[PDB]
Write a protein that binds this ligand. Structure first.
Ligand SMILES: Cc1cc2nc3c(=O)[nH]c(=O)nc-3n(C[C@H](O)[C@H](O)[C@H](O)COP(=O)(O)O)c2cc1C
Ligand code: SF4
Ligand code: SF4
Ligand code: SF4
Ligand code: FES
Ligand code: FES
Lengths: 87, 41, 212, 428, 263
């Protein structure tokens, strides 16, 4: 239920072919950008870094949860359907 | 008087006394409220 | 003890149980005891009534109560596990209880428990092979003054001693369900050493009345 | 206004607390009840709450809070819901027998006082929740209610009054936690006896989501004659802040254990000596006393000779009054065994929804058993004190407090006995 | 308007009535620890871990359930609240079983991380734990109930979101056992979401059973193709394979919930 792993804009790369190593079965690669992750306090910083280093980017906007009206008294209503049958 | 015990009727109560009396009392009691609803489902 | 159910041959969803035609009258009275909605309030009296018609609560009873009330059965299972006055396993004709909280542990309750063990030949939580008596150690029961006490099918025997429960048991075995109350010189909560609180007549109406 | 504990029978507000005259109507009517109830009701609701606030009547259940203030929390009109009155009779705390002894032997006081409380407040009806083990008492009460309905004191015209009332009797199923204000309400609603968080308060949303004010038996049973005799008269007895009569249950290690109505602020020693004649072996043989039932700490005999049976006094003595169920120990009984038994009880009677009383009560139970056997070391005593203080104000209901307070009372006044048992077990 | 000025460690914040302390502090950035409250389920203050002092009130309050009043300062990093959290963690971890390397919610446990931040580092518990009978729900949800913390975050889901009402609590005390009183296949189209709801690993998934661990996993944000709802999804890989599926959070679709097919 924690949200601190959010709050920082990251910049990943597209994934590429991994394959079974014929000896032991390890996962191999032919790209070095596989384990690549950067972090940016904001978004324009990330667009800037990408435009600067020559990468075509797709930006996924910030997803924030809707605020909500909680009430511990709605669980014990006379008329509503929030009257929970448990406790 | 004040010489003996006079809550004596409870020495001969059955199992269905409380419920028989609530039954006899349901006649006297008034209509009840209504939440405009049959259940919270 | 368990708080989980496993379908025995005896206890199962097809173990037979349906209320009698009069208990249904009592049930609809109980449902009139609460508003039109919130008819789920009658779970406690209706389950107690089923227990009172069969002695114990099979799963069949716990589900027929739900069917009658149109409550989910799980809520009934919750309610039956929580409250201890419900017998989720079969018991005898005389369900005996003994208080062992301090106001009655402190007036020789273990003595009564020992005498009630040896006189019956059982351990504490066991039931007799004739399925007549049982025994359990429970908490307070609201008669802490008359400290050494018991409860035998919704009646109290209080202020008692070993001889005055041996006599009780031998009176129960021959069918004479005896008179409840203090098995001593007392008849109620009053001090055994004569009256000390009030001995004059109580005053009539209109006494000490304020204007109005 | 000094050293007043003794009184006479004109003031005995529980004239038949021993079942010696009659419990039915014909016989109770002589003892001054149902007398001027129409005039009481039609006098006004605010007049009743004024009588209450002038009487200084604190809640004669466990938590003593001034009524009048409590009952005035739903004087406001109804915003589209009915109002209800729950009378509490789940007399489950150890030592407490007074509500039983009034339930039988004087139900009509309760009935008329409950009516008076409803009309002082607003209430379509009332729900007299009573313990499941009190079958015969509840049946006496149902018979009394039936006689009242028949005689015309309740129903479509409650003693006239232009006000209609009903009185229901809900029957519990054997759980001490269902004495709480909110576990009681949920049990009436048809669920487990699990308290609520408070807020919400029962006066805005309570039973069936409707306003309620929960009240104890005597708290209401003394209401109608208070209205009938004034708050000046009820407040004249007792100290200025905690006034009135008081039922006193006495248990354990005394020659004549008894229930008594007495004057509040009476000394504990006057109470024990006059009624329930001297403890076994006399005062010198006294070791410790619990003034409440079990949710109050111990007293060491150092402050038994110089202490008044009040809320304020026992609070000043790092203790508290509850339902005033005196319990006595007399040097011939292991005390740690008694408190371990009390904690075994508070473990059995926990509901379990909030973590502290779910686990820590079981901690303290196990540790106090280990202290009884002596299989511990004194570095755990302050650890268990810390466990108590963790449980205290971290709970939904005050059963964690009631579990933690006897522990503190024993650690504060009887620590060297724990030390001795530990060193004995260690040597052997 | 219908606003309220509230302070959080002094810092002011404007919130509506009907809110709580947890939401007020979230508007600042602080999230209060928690094991019972979810933000999509009915409130039940059963963990007592959301405890904060107010600057002059004598005791602490459930921040998940207490509505916030005009003119309040919420003290989150005060010694009273920290003492409360340490005690609550002591009690939670008292009877909890040493099954962290077994448990599949091993590097995903809120209990771990909350013991690591908001809890002590030592057990003063010298007594025997308990052990609870396990339940055979079905082929998906693997119940190991010797470790349930009795938070009721599952019964509320099953009653309010799945609309099932076949899950509850049996008994009381430590002996309270969550689940059914009987053998019943909790077999619904929203049943695998309890695996995400239960912060503890009291119930996990059987397909993912014992396979991987969260630090090993790379996570690619994809979508679903089973139904036409467009439920946003996280596909978790491990060395070029697919290990499990998880929901994403989008409030217009897949409100933290996904069907049992696509997971
Ligand atoms: C665990 C617990 C059990 C309680 N049991 C009772 C009880 O059995 N009878 C009672 O009158 N009050 C009991 N109380 C206190 C009630 O809250 C109180 O009686 C009620 O609020 C009415 O207060 P009053 O004295 O002002 O009428 C209990 C409280 C707790 C925390
Ligand atoms: S203190 Fe005990 S009885 Fe009270 S709510 Fe918490 S767990 Fe239940
Ligand atoms: S839920 Fe699993 S990982 Fe978390 S503390 Fe319990 S055993 Fe350890
Ligand atoms: S099974 Fe999980 S979600 Fe359900 S009560 Fe236990 S810890 Fe909470
Ligand atoms: S303590 Fe034994 S009856 Fe109350
Ligand atoms: S998060 Fe508030 S009590 Fe659980």
């Amino acid at each position: 239920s924690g949200v601190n792993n959010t709050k920082k804009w990251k910049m990943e790369f597209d994934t590429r072919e991994r394959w079974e190593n014929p000896l032991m079965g390890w996962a191999s690669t032919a790209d070095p950008l596989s384990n690549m992750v950067l972090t940016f306090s904001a978004k324009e910083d990330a667009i800037a870094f990408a435009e600067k280093n020559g990468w075509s980017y797709d930006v996924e906007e910030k997803k924030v949860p809707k605020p909500k009206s909680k009430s511990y008294g709605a669980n014990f209503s006379w008329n509503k359907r929030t009257r929970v049958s448990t406790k | 008087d004040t010489t003996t015990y006079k809550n004596l009727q409870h020495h001969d109560y059955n199992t269905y006394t409380f419920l028989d009396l609530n039954l006899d009392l349901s006649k006297f009691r008034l209509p009840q409220p209504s939440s405009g609803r049959e259940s919270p489902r | 003890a368990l708080f989980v159910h496993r379908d025995t041959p005896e206890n199962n969803p097809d173990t037979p149980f349906d209320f009698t035609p009069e208990n249904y009258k009592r049930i609809e009275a109980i449902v009139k005891n609460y508003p039109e909605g919130h008819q789920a309030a009658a779970v406690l009296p209706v389950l107690d009534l089923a227990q009172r018609q069969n002695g114990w609560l099979p799963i069949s009873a716990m589900n027929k109560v739900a069917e009658v009330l149109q409550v989910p059965p799980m809520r009934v299972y919750e309610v039956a596990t929580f409250y201890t006055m419900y017998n989720r396993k079969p018991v005898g004709k005389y369900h005996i209880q003994v208080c062992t909280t301090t106001p009655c542990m402190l007036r020789d309750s273990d003595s009564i428990l020992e005498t009630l063990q040896r006189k019956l030949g059982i351990k504490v939580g066991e039931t007799t092979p004739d399925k007549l008596f049982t025994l359990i150690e429970v908490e307070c029961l609201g008669a802490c003054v008359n400290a050494p006490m018991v409860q035998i099918n919704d009646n109290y025997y209080e202020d008692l001693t070993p001889k005055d429960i041996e006599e009780i048991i031998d009176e129960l075995k021959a069918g004479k369900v005896p008179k409840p109350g203090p098995r001593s010189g007392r008849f109620c909560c009053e001090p055994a050493g004569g009256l000390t609180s009030l001995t004059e007549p109580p005053k009539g109406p209109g006494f000490g009345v304020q204007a109005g | 206004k000094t050293s007043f504990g003794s009184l006479k029978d004109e003031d005995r507000i529980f004239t038949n607390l021993y079942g010696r005259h009659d419990w039915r109507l014909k016989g109770a009517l002589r003892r001054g009840d149902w007398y001027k109830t129409k005039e009481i009701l039609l006098k006004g609701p605010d007049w009743i709450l004024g009588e209450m606030k002038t009487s200084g009547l604190r809640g004669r259940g466990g938590a003593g809070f001034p009524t009048g203030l409590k009952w005035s929390f739903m004087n406001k009109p109804s915003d589209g819901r009915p109002k209800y009155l729950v009378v509490n009779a789940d007399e489950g705390e150890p030592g407490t027998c007074k509500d039983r002894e009034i339930m039988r032997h004087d139900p009509h006081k309760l009935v008329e006082g409950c009516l008076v409380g409803g009309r002082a407040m607003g209430a379509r009806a009332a729900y007299i929740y009573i313990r499941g083990e009190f079958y015969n008492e509840a049946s006496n009460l149902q018979v009394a209610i039936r006689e009242a309905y028949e005689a015309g004191l309740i129903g479509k015209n409650a003693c006239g009054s232009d006000y209609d009332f009903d009185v229901f009797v809900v029957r519990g199923a054997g759980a001490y936690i269902c004495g709480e204000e909110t576990a009681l309400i949920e049990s009436i609603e048809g669920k487990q006896g699990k308290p609520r968080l408070k807020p919400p308060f029962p006066a805005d949303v309570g039973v069936f989501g409707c306003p309620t004010t929960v009240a104890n038996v005597e708290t209401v049973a003394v209401s109608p004659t208070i209205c009938r005799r004034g708050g000046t008269w009820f407040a004249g007895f007792g100290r200025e802040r905690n006034s009135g009569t008081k039922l006193f249950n006495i248990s354990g290690h005394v020659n004549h254990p008894c229930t008594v109505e007495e004057e509040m602020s009476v000394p504990l020693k006057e109470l024990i000596e006059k009624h329930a004649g001297g403890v076994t072996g006399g005062w010198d043989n006294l070791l410790a006393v619990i003034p409440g039932g079990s949710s109050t700490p111990l007293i060491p005999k150092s402050v038994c000779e110089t202490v008044l049976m009040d809320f304020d006094a026992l609070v000043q003595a790092q203790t508290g009054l509850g339902t005033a169920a005196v319990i006595v120990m007399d040097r011939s009984t292991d005390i740690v065994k008694a408190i371990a038994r009390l904690i075994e009880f508070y473990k059995h009677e926990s509901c379990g929804q909030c973590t502290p009383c779910r686990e820590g009560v079981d901690w303290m139970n196990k540790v106090m058993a280990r202290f009884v056997k002596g299989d511990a070391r004194p570095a755990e005593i302050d650890s268990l004190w810390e466990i108590s203080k963790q449980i205290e104000g971290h709970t939904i209901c005050a059963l964690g407090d009631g579990a933690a307070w006897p522990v503190q009372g024993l650690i504060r006044h009887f620590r060297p006995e724990l030390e001795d048992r530990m060193q004995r077990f260690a040597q052997q | 308007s219908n606003l309220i000025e509230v302070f959080v460690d002094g810092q002011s914040v404007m919130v509506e009535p009907g809110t709580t302390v947890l939401q007020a502090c979230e508007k600042v950035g602080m999230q209060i620890p928690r094991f019972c409250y979810h933000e999509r389920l009915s409130v039940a203050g059963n963990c007592r871990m959301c405890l904060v002092e107010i600057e002059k009130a004598p005791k602490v309050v459930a921040a998940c359930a207490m509505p916030v009043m005009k003119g309040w300062n919420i003290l989150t990093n005060s010694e009273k609240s920290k003492k409360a959290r340490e005690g609550v963690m002591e009690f939670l971890l008292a009877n909890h079983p040493l099954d962290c390397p077994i448990c599949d919610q091993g590097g995903e446990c809120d209990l771990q991380d909350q013991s690591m931040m908001f809890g002590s580092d030592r057990s003063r518990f010298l007594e025997g734990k308990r052990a609870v009978e396990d339940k055979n729900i079905g082929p998906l949800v693997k119940t190991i109930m010797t470790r349930c913390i009795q938070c009721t975050r599952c019964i509320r889901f099953a009653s309010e979101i799945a609309g099932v009402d076949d899950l509850g609590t049996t008994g009381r005390g430590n002996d309270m056992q969550v689940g059914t009183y009987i053998e019943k296949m909790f077999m619904s189209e929203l049943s695998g979401n309890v695996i995400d709801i239960c912060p503890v690993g009291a119930l996990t998934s059987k397909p993912y059973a014992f396979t991987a661990r969260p630090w090993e996993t790379r996570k690619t944000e994809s979508i679903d193709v089973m139904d036409a709802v467009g439920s946003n999804i996280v596909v978790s890989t491990r060395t070029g394979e697919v290990m499990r599926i998880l929901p994403r959070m989008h409030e217009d679709i897949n409100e933290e919930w996904i069907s049992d097919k696509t997971r």
